[PDB]
Symmetry: C2
Subunit: 254 residues, 2 copies
């Protein structure tokens, strides 16, 4: 693959500011993850500058990126959480450590979002987001000029299907209609929010706000995530894509 | 000091199930803290048994106890957070790590309380506590038969006075009337909640619920905490006290 050329195709196809088509020797998930994670860290290091407000998220890919981060002597940087929290899982989300590592690399301390990912009732979610203290955190998430995230998939094993937040109807709807999530907000193959009812009781950065950011950075790859990435990029939620060449070719071939 | 006799005085004076008066060679805060932390971990190890629900909290003493924890082959144990979260501080609270270390030592995974310590409005706090998912976490906190905490003080330094949660009037009230906090709930020298108005918009285990537990364990010491410990014990919020022999003598002397 001509990574430059292949990046150009993606930039044209989805209207990206930048598409970084990273060499990975093989197409298996772990290798792709290792290479994108390393590339991600360097990019963040190159890109982050005095005064930036950096919105981050949590998940296995994000954690690996965080671990790879190298210290950078920058000032006035804030690092804020964009994704809500869960109350229990058998696997550690490493959410705290992830934002800690990011914060430390940029000479600041985490701005946490101390809320659950979902409320049972949208009226409660709305009054929580209007809490004077919470609103400031959400506002910092909007002000963020860099946002860093991966996409999740809609497999049976997905975390968010396994936490009691959704009844039979809701899980079936998401499995049928959604291709993935950004920060726990589920979208379809055209980038549309699948269920406004569900999304209206979910906490985290609003997907439409991502489109406004100077750099909205999606790091993702693996055949498992092709539909998800396509949906996210069709919805135009990222302007910078970090992706390996196997996945990048899979996206073009349709 | 005769530790056993001095423990007996404390058990009678405050009506404690157990008073563990721990030897520390000096009245130095750090030294007291190191010895109490170690004794704490040992006690927790001895005490925790198959099927216990353990309520923990976060802070520097708690973090230290968690670090000293040794693995225990126990089963069916749940470990749950009793103390709400903050959104930022310049010092890491180690809240995540603290509850992780406790959970791992007891062969389980943390049950987080993904909420802020304070809401601006009590009607919002109440609606959040009644959220179906949140209510289960609070219920687990109530069901907990072991609770582990220290007391905080009311000095100008105190975290909770520096986070925007309280206006001038409220900070002055707590400074004048409170002697300390347990899990961010402020009480006076007689153990009474200082401000029901503030307390009604604060998240975390309710102090009155601590009195019902099989073991409500207070680890605390240092001349800085004499008034705080006295208030907490006068309110009878702990039935097990882990304290060094300097502080313990200071309590008897009034």
């Amino acid at each position: 693959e001509d990574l430059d050329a292949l990046g150009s195709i993606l930039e044209e196809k989805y209207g990206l500011l930048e598409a970084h088509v990273v060499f990975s020797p093989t197409p298996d998930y772990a290798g792709i993850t290792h290479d994108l994670s390393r590339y991600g860290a360097e990019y963040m290091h190159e890109t982050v500058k005095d005064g930036d407000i950096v919105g981050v998220s949590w998940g296995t890919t994000m954690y690996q990126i965080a671990q790879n981060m190298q210290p950078k002597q920058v000032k006035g940087v804030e690092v804020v959480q964009l994704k809500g929290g869960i109350s229990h899982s058998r696997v550690n989300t490493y959410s705290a450590e992830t934002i800690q590592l990011f914060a430390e690399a940029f000479q600041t301390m985490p701005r946490y979002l101390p809320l659950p990912v979902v409320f049972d009732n949208a009226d409660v979610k709305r009054m929580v987001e209007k809490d004077r203290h919470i609103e400031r955190i959400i506002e910092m998430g909007k002000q963020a000029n860099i946002a860093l995230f991966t996409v999740g998939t809609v497999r049976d094993e997905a975390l968010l299907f396994r936490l009691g937040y959704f009844n039979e109807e809701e899980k079936a709807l998401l499995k049928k209609q959604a291709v993935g999530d950004i920060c726990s907000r589920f979208f379809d193959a055209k980038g549309n929010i699948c269920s406004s009812a569900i999304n209206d009781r979910t906490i985290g950065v609003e997907l439409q706000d991502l489109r406004l950011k100077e750099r909205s950075i999606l790091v993702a790859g693996g055949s498992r995530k092709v539909s998800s990435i396509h949906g996210a990029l069709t919805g135009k939620y990222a302007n910078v894509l970090i992706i390996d060449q196997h996945t990048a070719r899979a996206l073009v071939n349709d």
